[PDB]
Structure 1
């Protein structure tokens, strides 16, 4: 079995920006989630080879994880905060699609998504450079 290449965290041609909102995503939102006791399964791409999940990447065609998001924010990969928010949403969605509702990993993801949504209500209202 093989894993796919992970999602890119840098791209030489993609315009880069640091916005007030992107800075709040790094300094607050991701800080809270990264350090939470439920974060660790989500800190790196799903390793389908080590987990013995040969169907994972047959079912999940848009992978995403918090390690990728952290590297994207540190590399100033994004133009806007909505791209980052979309990545968190993808990560949660993937967990809910692959696993059975009420598996422990799903309940953990639900708890992190609830926390995520709480924190992103405190984003600066207007995105500015």
Structure 2
């Protein structure tokens, strides 16, 4: 149908906007601490601590499959990156500190993304 096509175009355009959001958020992690999944070879007990792992490569796979239906779902995954790190790692670590900076700096980017998604429908 023409309606299913129009909906597919809306999803494609959301995917385009979220791809730009993801790029901007990932620039706020210049050390690449959140780039890839925590290695279960190197942290073999991680899943005993963290039940829903997340990282920027995993978000990118979901994005490219158009697997985000709205900005809320995308923010949920970004928040897991931050929140998983801040639980697993102690406050006095480079990991925790990197998450705090990513959270603080990403808030700005996400604030305007919310407006652009509401604005452009």
TM-score exceeds 0.5: yes
Contact kept? 2:26, 2:56, Cα under 8 Å: yes
Residue 125 of structure 1 deviates from its aligned partner by 5.1
Residue 24 of structure 1 deviates from its aligned partner by 2.5
Q: Gapped runs of 5+ residues in structure 1?
A: 1-15
TM-score normalised by the chain length of structure 1: 0.74
Residue of structure 2 in register with 1:45 after alignment: 37
| Cα 1:128–1:32 shift into 2, 3 Å | closer
Residue 112 (str. 1) matches residue 102 (str. 2)? yes
More helix by share: 2
TM-score normalised by the chain length of structure 2: 0.78
Looking at structure 2, the residues matched to 21 and 120 of structure 1 have their Cα atoms a distance apart, in angstroms, of 14
Residue of structure 1 in register with 2:49 after alignment: 59
Residue of structure 2 in register with 1:73 after alignment: 63
Residue 126 of structure 1 deviates from its aligned partner by 1.0
Root mean square deviation of aligned Cα: 2.2
Q: Gapped runs of 5+ residues in structure 2?
A: 1-7
Q: Write out per-residue CA displacement over residues 31-74 of structure 1, whole angstroms, 9 at most, x where no aligned residue.
A: 12324413x2211111021x2x2321101011111111111112
Runs of 4+ in 1 over 6 A off after TM superposition: none
| Cα 1:127–1:71 shift into 2, 3 Å | farther
Flag the structure with larger Rg. Answer: 2
Residue 33 (str. 1) matches residue 13 (str. 2)? no
Contact kept? 1:19, 1:80, Cα under 8 Å: no
Residue of structure 1 in register with 2:17 after alignment: 24
Residue of structure 2 in register with 1:101 after alignment: 91
